[PDB]
Amino acid sequence: LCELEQKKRTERAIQHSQDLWKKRTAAKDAHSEKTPELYDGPFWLKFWRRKKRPGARG
RNA sequence: UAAUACAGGGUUGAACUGUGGGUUAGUUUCAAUGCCCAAGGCAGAGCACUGGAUUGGAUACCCAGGGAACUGUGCUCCCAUUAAUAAGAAUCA
């Protein structure tokens, strides 16, 4: 029974790994096929400055 | 800050890579104007200076003219010296 359990677990793990690989490969292929998107939103002049802890201790 | 030429950086993705970093002097690339030097030299405007006024009075503010300075792989970094109150990690959806 232990051996049969191990064999069934192996088969299930093989199937799961193959499915995961196919999904990931498809996603990355689609990413590659897509043309680079150009960020067209607002800029970061507000974020250029930072407000950290003032004085010593920072 | 149109096009073109030569170079970055940023953003997005794929691949690669596999603790390969954070900070930094016996370090040095860059860096407003002025000054020194060199260039040119009369588009504009404009220190000193001249003369036309106001003022007890003005060496100024106002007006007219003006040969100092205004474009440099040079000399070069003084400063109320440049995106701030140094840089990095953690805490947040």
Side-chain angles (χ1 to χ4, degrees), chain A residues 36-53:
Chain A
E37 68 98 29
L38 191 61
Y39 169 78
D40 208 359
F43 307 115
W44 320 89
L45 304 179
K46 57 172 287 188
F47 301 102
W48 283 15
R49 187 191 201 175
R50 316 173 85 175
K51 289 181 175 185
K52 308 179 181 180
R53 192 198 291 201

Side-chain angles (χ1 to χ4, degrees), chain A residues 9-50:
Chain A
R9 264 178 292 184
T10 54
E11 192 65 6
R12 267 193 281 91
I14 293 168
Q15 275 291 4
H16 187 61
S17 183
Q18 185 168 353
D19 290 328
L20 280 169
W21 177 268
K22 183 157 68 68
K23 182 190 181 65
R24 216 174 302 172
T25 308
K28 275 166 176 177
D29 280 359
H31 279 96
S32 71
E33 298 155 24
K34 166 168 168 294
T35 180
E37 68 98 29
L38 191 61
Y39 169 78
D40 208 359
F43 307 115
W44 320 89
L45 304 179
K46 57 172 287 188
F47 301 102
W48 283 15
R49 187 191 201 175
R50 316 173 85 175

